[PDB]
């Protein structure tokens, strides 16, 4: 079988295994900071440098994958804590949308909320133009920040959050488990056909953004990933 | 929210936090050995002593859970490497079936292969009486060892295996991700209505078994767990 | 620190994690066949798609690495069994030398035998023009196929060979263990200052070649690898 | 030439191939446990019964060798995690130092920290009496636990470590590659003249020890080895 697996305990600029897009920066503690606290409509994204083959046009098979990561969002003065973080999957040529206004687009869609991607978002502001739930939430996105499904969640300022995701190729289920700082877990699952919504080659990463009045610290602290694709 | 969580980097008989049933034993290295290599039709199980409330007859809500554990299986001359380990959920009064014949029942069912439980099996022998697949496999079981669904796997003697399990109550989906020695992951998912198959309070645990000629080492190395029930 | 690692039990055409150069090909059994038995001066190379930082100009630190792979060379009528395989390290922009005549250059050098790389060769033909020993041999090469050092070895047709390489940055020592067919091991060590011979970013890989009358099957069966660069 | 190779996926007492000394013991899982968690100043060692001829007084030739092994060290309440494991080579009549205080002596040296042996230590406690580095480390010892050289390492409790060692007789270099739970590899090499420090025949093995307020589980899980000496 064909397998891709890596494990970043910390990060560093200069590491060829990571592509940085937008206002991304690396703190001396090894943490990746996605947004610029002084830029309007700031957008920052990080991607696993190497493209990943999630399905084969020859066999018709689709890969399964186990991945885990931890992040943090902390408030600042005197901006509104926004907008959130999103773990996404997209075409290997994925780039920050042109004229991106950040905000609720999470740096992955256009102003209308559309884009070519699949991801799990950790939304901390309610953008009605995207039909967001009234409170903080985790959501499953398929080519849109207007989630196919969401679940109530709470973003604690300065809290270290852990996430684990499993994509069972056979059932096409994308399962997400979120462990908050206080110990409780929040989950959300949804059938998503990666073969129908994405190309054979893709890139995984994280993206975050803010607006003029909405800003906050967005940090990625760790990330492990393992995908396996059956060749016969 | 009603949350239950714990972590074991090692175990030890003497810690009431765990029930010890059957031939189970705890090795000086903190490993839980499930079966007795010298016994015939051996059966050993271990349970987290505190019963977990998976659903409320009050709210009608079902809990979600994220659990991870590592185990190890190793061959021993001159017996056929059987029968395997099963991670199960069952009534809080669960006990090894009366007059258990071990072997393919994995220590959780009667001879016909029936019992009261829900679990994930890591089967290493092909019992035809239970409709097992030709090779080693991971299966989702509901009240029977005649798995509801299975995926081809391979048990490597001496190899330390990791497993992550997610149960999303809303979609009633159980997701399993097994990390193999060669590096590949293997997944299997299945919709299982816990609230319809198990009582309000249950006990989580592990079980393993052998027969006259089928025997091997079954070890549980570690195990973390977290369940959250919405009480609103 | 910064680490790159992987493990290939088999290969496949299409995996974006690998760069194919020249007459390389992938067999139905997963093996990588480096040369084309019908071409004159055939040359095929395979490199890990992602660049590895073996040293940092900012800190001055040099990474260490551990790697193991297995290959097979099989005779074919009526050509002379040549020319062999070389595990090498080169700048990330590496390509098969323009106008390569294959043969004794092993696909990494020009006619005089010079080039920009570091590698371990498993030579099965004596090219007097490159001061080769009279018999088959394993050699440490630094910017030339005129080995810095060699040790007598023997290529057994159809035999699977296991190789282990360790690079200790502190002593700049490159150690090689080779597992013959008859069970014996052969070793060779040489001090090579990578920080002095190569750029910060390089690629790792294999290469094989042939001439008009010299041809043989060159197969790479497996490959694991891990290198770590201290970022402090 | 003259070769000696073996491989252990599991060991057992009552097996000729291996010698046991001190508090050694073999757990049901085939693992070797060196130090006894109960006794004070415990010391356990294991040796490959058949002595190996590393050099010839007739030719002057010295053998080369490649050996790999995995081990596990795990904490225990409420003792200190010490002292470590050491892979060593010594005269065929080697025995545990008379009136051994175990502990920082690793079971191979005397109180002053001296003995007849060459080895690679995996140290988890810093003994000032032997000039140890401030943190955990891997060291190359030559007739003394006051390492000829050391490298910063980190022993992770409950984790499995894979070790690779190459000895190139020609350059007299000993190279060590050690695994890390975080995916990082560590290396250390040192020129060691075996012929000068050891007799023609020796024994390879493992040794571990504990003190009064310092104990921990020391396990040897597997061990393969191959040495070849030219006899002409
Ligand atoms: O408060 C946070 C929230 O801001 C929205 O942006 C508005 C922007 O359109 C305009 O009206 O100016 C105000 C304050 O100057 C806000 O910046 C975003 O659309 C949301 O995504 C979120 O950042
Ligand atoms: O070989 C392994 C396998 O054994 C079956 O048990 C049989 C038992 O009925 C009787 O015939 O004796 C033989 C001895 O060779 C076996 O022990 C189990 O039914 C299987 O589950 C598995 O253990
Ligand atoms: O026999 C193998 C050997 O061949 C050399 O190449 C010669 C080539 O120069 C010319 O003389 O033609 C013959 C056969 O007709 C060979 O192809 C290579 O230089 C060696 O490296 C090796 O392949
Ligand atoms: O804590 C571990 C460490 O113990 C040292 O042993 C001392 C012993 O001599 C005496 O002073 O009592 C104390 C108790 O606090 C320790 O047991 C060893 O010298 C070290 O090698 C290591 O085992
Ligand atoms: Ca929003
Ligand atoms: Ca079975
Ligand atoms: Ca040659
Ligand atoms: Ca010490
Ligand atoms: Mn949203
Ligand atoms: Mn089964
Ligand atoms: Mn040569
Ligand atoms: Mn030391």
Coordinates of N, CA and C in Angstrom, one line a residue, chain D residues 16-189:
Chain D
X16 N 19.8 -22.7 25.9 CA 21.3 -22.7 25.9 C 22.0 -21.4 25.4
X17 N 21.5 -21.0 24.2 CA 22.1 -19.8 23.5 C 22.4 -18.6 24.4
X18 N 21.7 -18.5 25.5 CA 22.0 -17.3 26.3 C 22.3 -17.5 27.8
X19 N 23.2 -16.7 28.4 CA 23.6 -16.7 29.8 C 22.9 -15.6 30.5
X20 N 22.5 -16.0 31.8 CA 21.8 -15.0 32.6 C 22.7 -14.8 33.9
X21 N 22.7 -13.6 34.4 CA 23.5 -13.3 35.6 C 22.8 -12.2 36.4
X22 N 22.9 -12.3 37.7 CA 22.2 -11.3 38.6 C 20.7 -11.6 38.7
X23 N 20.0 -10.4 38.8 CA 18.5 -10.5 39.0 C 17.7 -10.6 37.7
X24 N 18.4 -11.0 36.6 CA 17.7 -11.1 35.3 C 16.5 -12.0 35.4
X25 N 15.6 -11.9 34.5 CA 14.3 -12.6 34.4 C 13.6 -12.5 33.0
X26 N 12.9 -13.5 32.6 CA 12.2 -13.4 31.3 C 10.7 -13.5 31.5
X27 N 10.0 -12.4 31.1 CA 8.6 -12.4 31.3 C 7.8 -13.2 30.2
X28 N 6.6 -13.7 30.6 CA 5.8 -14.5 29.7 C 5.8 -14.1 28.2
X29 N 6.0 -12.8 28.0 CA 6.0 -12.3 26.6 C 7.3 -12.4 25.9
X30 N 8.2 -13.2 26.5 CA 9.5 -13.4 25.8 C 10.5 -12.3 26.1
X31 N 10.1 -11.2 26.8 CA 11.0 -10.1 27.1 C 12.0 -10.4 28.2
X32 N 13.2 -9.7 28.1 CA 14.2 -9.8 29.2 C 14.1 -8.6 30.1
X33 N 13.9 -8.9 31.4 CA 13.9 -7.9 32.4 C 15.2 -8.0 33.2
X34 N 16.0 -7.0 33.1 CA 17.3 -7.0 33.8 C 17.3 -6.7 35.4
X35 N 16.8 -5.5 35.7 CA 16.8 -5.2 37.2 C 15.5 -5.6 37.8
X36 N 15.6 -6.0 39.1 CA 14.4 -6.4 39.8 C 13.9 -5.2 40.5
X37 N 12.6 -4.9 40.4 CA 12.0 -3.7 41.0 C 12.0 -3.8 42.5
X38 N 12.0 -5.0 43.1 CA 12.0 -5.2 44.5 C 13.3 -5.0 45.3
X39 N 14.3 -5.8 44.8 CA 15.7 -5.8 45.5 C 16.4 -4.4 45.5
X40 N 17.3 -4.2 46.4 CA 18.1 -3.0 46.4 C 19.4 -3.2 45.7
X41 N 19.9 -2.1 45.1 CA 21.1 -2.2 44.3 C 21.0 -3.4 43.3
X42 N 19.9 -3.5 42.6 CA 19.7 -4.7 41.7 C 20.6 -4.6 40.5
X43 N 21.0 -5.7 40.0 CA 21.9 -5.8 38.8 C 21.5 -7.1 38.0
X44 N 21.2 -6.8 36.8 CA 20.9 -8.0 35.9 C 21.6 -7.8 34.6
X45 N 22.1 -8.9 34.1 CA 22.9 -8.9 32.8 C 22.6 -10.2 32.0
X46 N 22.7 -10.0 30.7 CA 22.5 -11.2 29.8 C 23.6 -11.2 28.8
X47 N 24.1 -12.4 28.5 CA 25.2 -12.6 27.5 C 24.9 -13.7 26.5
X48 N 25.4 -13.5 25.3 CA 25.2 -14.5 24.3 C 26.2 -15.6 24.7
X49 N 25.7 -16.8 25.1 CA 26.5 -17.9 25.5 C 27.7 -18.2 24.7
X50 N 27.6 -18.3 23.4 CA 28.8 -18.6 22.5 C 29.7 -17.4 22.3
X51 N 31.0 -17.5 22.8 CA 31.9 -16.4 22.7 C 32.2 -16.1 21.2
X52 N 32.4 -14.9 20.9 CA 32.7 -14.4 19.5 C 34.1 -14.0 19.4
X53 N 34.7 -14.4 18.3 CA 36.1 -14.1 18.0 C 36.2 -12.8 17.2
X54 N 36.5 -11.7 17.8 CA 36.6 -10.4 17.2 C 37.9 -10.1 16.5
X55 N 39.0 -10.8 16.9 CA 40.3 -10.5 16.2 C 41.2 -11.7 16.3
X56 N 42.2 -11.7 15.4 CA 43.1 -12.8 15.3 C 44.6 -12.5 15.7
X57 N 45.2 -13.2 16.6 CA 46.5 -13.0 17.0 C 47.5 -13.6 16.0
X58 N 46.9 -14.3 15.0 CA 47.7 -14.9 13.9 C 47.8 -14.0 12.7
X59 N 46.7 -13.3 12.4 CA 46.7 -12.4 11.2 C 46.7 -11.0 11.6
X60 N 46.2 -10.6 12.7 CA 46.1 -9.3 13.2 C 44.7 -8.7 12.8
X61 N 44.0 -9.4 11.9 CA 42.7 -9.0 11.4 C 41.7 -8.8 12.6
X62 N 40.8 -7.8 12.4 CA 39.8 -7.6 13.4 C 38.4 -7.7 12.6
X63 N 37.4 -8.2 13.2 CA 36.1 -8.3 12.6 C 35.3 -7.1 12.5
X64 N 34.3 -7.1 11.6 CA 33.4 -6.0 11.5 C 32.1 -6.6 11.9
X65 N 31.1 -5.7 12.4 CA 29.8 -6.3 12.8 C 28.7 -5.2 12.7
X66 N 27.5 -5.8 12.6 CA 26.3 -5.0 12.6 C 25.3 -5.7 13.5
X67 N 24.7 -4.9 14.4 CA 23.8 -5.5 15.4 C 22.7 -4.5 15.7
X68 N 21.4 -5.0 15.8 CA 20.3 -4.1 16.1 C 19.5 -4.7 17.2
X69 N 18.9 -3.9 18.1 CA 18.2 -4.3 19.2 C 17.2 -3.3 19.7
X70 N 16.1 -3.7 20.3 CA 15.1 -2.8 20.8 C 15.0 -3.0 22.3
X71 N 14.7 -2.0 23.1 CA 14.5 -2.1 24.5 C 13.4 -1.1 25.0
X72 N 13.0 -1.3 26.2 CA 12.0 -0.4 26.8 C 12.3 -0.2 28.3
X73 N 12.2 1.1 28.7 CA 12.5 1.5 30.0 C 11.2 2.2 30.5
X74 N 10.6 1.8 31.6 CA 9.4 2.4 32.1 C 9.4 2.7 33.6
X75 N 8.9 3.8 34.0 CA 8.9 4.3 35.3 C 8.0 3.4 36.2
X76 N 8.2 3.6 37.5 CA 7.5 2.9 38.6 C 7.4 3.8 39.8
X77 N 6.2 3.9 40.4 CA 6.0 4.7 41.6 C 6.5 3.8 42.7
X78 N 7.2 4.4 43.7 CA 7.4 5.8 43.8 C 9.0 5.9 43.9
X79 N 9.6 5.2 43.0 CA 11.1 5.2 42.9 C 11.6 6.1 41.8
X80 N 12.9 6.5 41.8 CA 13.5 7.3 40.8 C 13.8 6.5 39.6
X81 N 13.6 7.1 38.4 CA 13.9 6.3 37.1 C 15.4 6.2 36.9
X82 N 16.0 5.1 37.3 CA 17.4 4.8 37.1 C 17.6 3.3 37.1
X83 N 18.8 2.9 36.6 CA 19.9 3.8 36.1 C 20.1 3.8 34.6
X84 N 19.7 2.7 34.0 CA 19.8 2.6 32.5 C 20.3 1.3 32.1
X85 N 20.4 1.1 30.8 CA 20.8 -0.1 30.1 C 22.1 0.1 29.4
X86 N 22.9 -0.9 29.3 CA 24.2 -0.8 28.6 C 24.5 -2.1 27.7
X87 N 24.8 -1.8 26.5 CA 25.1 -2.9 25.5 C 26.6 -3.0 25.7
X88 N 27.1 -4.1 26.0 CA 28.6 -4.2 26.2 C 29.3 -5.4 25.6
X89 N 30.6 -5.4 25.5 CA 31.4 -6.4 25.0 C 32.5 -6.7 26.0
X90 N 32.8 -7.9 26.3 CA 33.8 -8.2 27.4 C 34.4 -9.6 27.3
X91 N 35.5 -9.8 28.1 CA 36.1 -11.1 28.1 C 35.1 -12.2 28.3
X92 N 35.3 -13.4 27.8 CA 34.3 -14.4 27.9 C 34.0 -14.9 29.3
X93 N 34.8 -14.5 30.3 CA 34.6 -14.9 31.7 C 34.0 -13.7 32.5
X94 N 33.6 -12.7 31.8 CA 33.0 -11.6 32.5 C 31.9 -12.0 33.5
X95 N 31.8 -11.3 34.7 CA 30.8 -11.6 35.7 C 30.5 -10.3 36.4
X96 N 29.4 -10.2 37.0 CA 29.0 -9.0 37.7 C 30.0 -8.6 38.8
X97 N 30.5 -7.4 38.8 CA 31.5 -6.9 39.7 C 31.2 -7.4 41.1
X98 N 32.1 -8.0 41.8 CA 32.0 -8.5 43.2 C 31.6 -7.4 44.1
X99 N 30.5 -7.6 44.9 CA 30.0 -6.6 45.8 C 29.6 -5.3 45.1
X100 N 28.9 -5.5 43.9 CA 28.4 -4.4 43.1 C 27.4 -3.5 43.8
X101 N 27.5 -2.2 43.7 CA 26.6 -1.3 44.2 C 25.6 -0.9 43.2
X102 N 25.6 -1.6 42.0 CA 24.7 -1.4 40.9 C 24.6 0.1 40.6
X103 N 23.4 0.6 40.6 CA 23.2 2.0 40.4 C 24.0 2.5 39.2
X104 N 24.6 3.7 39.3 CA 25.4 4.3 38.3 C 26.5 3.4 37.7
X105 N 26.7 2.2 38.2 CA 27.8 1.4 37.7 C 27.3 0.5 36.5
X106 N 25.9 0.6 36.3 CA 25.3 -0.1 35.2 C 25.6 -1.6 35.3
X107 N 26.2 -2.1 36.4 CA 26.5 -3.5 36.5 C 27.6 -4.0 35.7
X108 N 28.6 -3.1 35.4 CA 29.7 -3.5 34.6 C 31.0 -3.0 35.2
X109 N 31.0 -2.0 36.0 CA 32.1 -1.4 36.6 C 32.1 -1.5 38.1
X110 N 33.2 -1.0 38.7 CA 33.3 -1.0 40.2 C 32.8 0.4 40.7
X111 N 32.9 0.5 42.0 CA 32.4 1.8 42.6 C 33.1 3.0 42.0
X112 N 34.4 2.9 41.7 CA 35.2 4.0 41.1 C 34.7 4.2 39.7
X113 N 34.0 3.2 39.1 CA 33.5 3.3 37.8 C 34.4 2.8 36.7
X114 N 35.0 1.6 37.0 CA 36.0 1.0 36.1 C 35.7 -0.5 35.9
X115 N 36.2 -1.0 34.7 CA 36.0 -2.4 34.5 C 36.6 -2.8 33.1
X116 N 36.6 -4.0 32.7 CA 37.1 -4.5 31.4 C 35.9 -4.7 30.5
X117 N 35.6 -3.7 29.6 CA 34.5 -3.8 28.7 C 34.4 -2.6 27.8
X118 N 33.8 -2.7 26.7 CA 33.5 -1.7 25.7 C 32.0 -1.8 25.6
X119 N 31.3 -0.6 25.6 CA 29.9 -0.6 25.5 C 29.2 0.7 25.2
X120 N 27.9 0.6 24.8 CA 27.1 1.7 24.5 C 26.0 1.8 25.6
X121 N 26.0 2.9 26.4 CA 25.1 3.1 27.4 C 23.9 4.0 27.1
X122 N 22.8 3.7 27.7 CA 21.6 4.5 27.6 C 21.3 4.9 29.0
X123 N 21.9 6.0 29.4 CA 21.8 6.5 30.8 C 20.7 7.4 31.1
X124 N 20.0 7.2 32.2 CA 18.8 8.0 32.6 C 19.0 8.8 34.0
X125 N 20.2 8.7 34.6 CA 20.4 9.4 35.8 C 21.8 10.0 35.8
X126 N 22.0 11.3 36.1 CA 23.3 11.9 36.1 C 24.1 11.8 37.3
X127 N 25.1 10.9 37.2 CA 26.1 10.6 38.4 C 27.3 11.6 38.3
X128 N 27.4 12.5 39.2 CA 28.5 13.4 39.2 C 29.8 12.7 39.5
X129 N 29.8 11.5 40.2 CA 31.0 10.8 40.5 C 31.6 10.2 39.3
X130 N 30.8 10.2 38.2 CA 31.3 9.6 36.9 C 31.3 10.7 35.8
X131 N 31.2 11.9 36.2 CA 31.2 13.1 35.3 C 30.1 13.1 34.3
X132 N 29.0 12.6 34.6 CA 27.9 12.6 33.6 C 27.4 13.9 33.2
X133 N 26.8 13.9 32.0 CA 26.2 15.2 31.4 C 25.0 15.5 32.3
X134 N 24.5 16.7 32.3 CA 23.4 17.1 33.1 C 22.1 16.3 32.9
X135 N 21.8 15.9 31.6 CA 20.6 15.2 31.3 C 20.8 13.8 30.8
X136 N 19.7 13.1 30.5 CA 19.8 11.8 30.0 C 20.7 11.8 28.7
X137 N 21.3 10.7 28.4 CA 22.2 10.6 27.3 C 22.6 9.2 26.9
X138 N 23.3 9.2 25.7 CA 23.7 7.9 25.2 C 25.3 8.1 25.2
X139 N 26.0 7.2 25.7 CA 27.4 7.3 25.7 C 28.2 6.1 25.3
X140 N 29.4 6.3 24.8 CA 30.3 5.2 24.3 C 31.4 5.0 25.5
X141 N 31.3 3.9 26.2 CA 32.3 3.6 27.3 C 33.3 2.6 26.9
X142 N 34.6 2.9 27.3 CA 35.7 2.1 27.1 C 36.4 1.8 28.5
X143 N 36.1 0.6 29.0 CA 36.6 0.3 30.4 C 36.3 1.3 31.5
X144 N 35.1 1.9 31.3 CA 34.7 2.9 32.3 C 33.3 3.6 32.0
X145 N 32.6 3.8 33.1 CA 31.3 4.5 32.9 C 31.4 6.0 32.8
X146 N 32.7 6.4 32.8 CA 33.0 7.8 32.7 C 33.2 8.0 31.2
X147 N 32.1 7.8 30.5 CA 32.1 7.9 29.0 C 33.2 8.6 28.3
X148 N 33.7 8.0 27.2 CA 34.7 8.6 26.4 C 34.1 9.7 25.6
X149 N 32.8 9.6 25.5 CA 32.0 10.6 24.8 C 30.5 10.4 25.0
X150 N 29.7 11.4 25.0 CA 28.3 11.2 25.2 C 27.5 12.2 24.3
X151 N 26.2 11.9 24.2 CA 25.3 12.8 23.3 C 24.0 12.9 24.1
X152 N 23.4 14.1 24.1 CA 22.1 14.3 24.8 C 21.0 13.5 24.1
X153 N 20.3 12.8 25.0 CA 19.3 11.9 24.6 C 18.1 12.1 25.6
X154 N 17.0 11.3 25.4 CA 15.9 11.4 26.3 C 15.2 10.1 26.3
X155 N 15.2 9.5 27.5 CA 14.5 8.2 27.7 C 13.0 8.5 28.0
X156 N 12.1 7.9 27.2 CA 10.7 8.1 27.3 C 10.1 6.8 28.0
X157 N 9.4 7.0 29.1 CA 8.8 5.8 29.8 C 7.8 5.1 29.0
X158 N 7.8 3.8 29.0 CA 6.9 3.0 28.3 C 7.1 2.9 26.8
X159 N 8.1 3.6 26.2 CA 8.4 3.7 24.8 C 9.4 2.6 24.3
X160 N 9.2 2.1 23.1 CA 10.1 1.1 22.5 C 11.2 1.8 21.7
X161 N 12.4 1.5 22.0 CA 13.6 2.1 21.3 C 14.3 1.1 20.4
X162 N 14.6 1.5 19.2 CA 15.3 0.6 18.2 C 16.8 1.1 18.1
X163 N 17.8 0.3 18.3 CA 19.1 0.7 18.2 C 19.9 0.0 17.1
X164 N 20.7 0.8 16.4 CA 21.6 0.2 15.3 C 23.0 0.5 15.6
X165 N 23.9 -0.5 15.5 CA 25.3 -0.3 15.7 C 26.2 -1.0 14.7
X166 N 27.1 -0.2 14.2 CA 28.0 -0.7 13.1 C 29.4 -0.5 13.6
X167 N 30.3 -1.5 13.4 CA 31.6 -1.5 13.8 C 32.4 -1.8 12.5
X168 N 33.2 -0.8 12.0 CA 34.0 -1.0 10.8 C 35.4 -1.2 11.3
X169 N 35.9 -2.4 11.2 CA 37.2 -2.7 11.7 C 38.3 -1.9 11.1
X170 N 38.2 -1.7 9.8 CA 39.2 -0.9 9.1 C 39.5 0.5 9.7
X171 N 38.4 1.3 9.9 CA 38.6 2.6 10.5 C 38.5 2.6 12.0
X172 N 38.1 1.4 12.6 CA 38.0 1.2 14.1 C 36.9 2.1 14.6
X173 N 35.9 2.4 13.8 CA 34.8 3.3 14.2 C 33.5 2.5 14.6
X174 N 33.0 3.0 15.7 CA 31.8 2.4 16.3 C 30.7 3.4 16.1
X175 N 29.6 3.1 15.3 CA 28.5 4.0 15.1 C 27.2 3.6 15.7
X176 N 26.5 4.5 16.3 CA 25.3 4.2 17.0 C 24.1 5.1 16.6
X177 N 23.1 4.5 16.1 CA 21.9 5.2 15.7 C 20.7 4.7 16.6
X178 N 20.1 5.7 17.3 CA 19.1 5.4 18.3 C 17.8 6.1 17.9
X179 N 16.7 5.4 18.1 CA 15.3 5.9 17.8 C 14.8 6.8 19.0
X180 N 13.8 7.6 18.7 CA 13.1 8.5 19.6 C 11.6 8.5 19.4
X181 N 10.9 8.5 20.5 CA 9.4 8.5 20.4 C 8.9 9.6 19.5
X182 N 9.6 10.7 19.5 CA 9.1 11.9 18.7 C 9.5 11.8 17.2
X183 N 10.1 10.6 16.8 CA 10.5 10.4 15.4 C 11.9 10.9 15.1
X184 N 12.6 11.4 16.0 CA 14.0 11.9 15.8 C 15.0 10.8 16.0
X185 N 16.1 10.8 15.3 CA 17.1 9.9 15.5 C 18.3 10.6 16.1
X186 N 19.1 9.9 16.9 CA 20.3 10.4 17.6 C 21.4 9.5 17.2
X187 N 22.6 10.1 17.0 CA 23.8 9.3 16.7 C 25.0 9.6 17.5
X188 N 26.0 8.8 17.5 CA 27.2 9.0 18.2 C 28.1 7.9 17.7
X189 N 29.3 8.3 17.3 CA 30.3 7.4 16.8 C 31.6 7.8 17.5

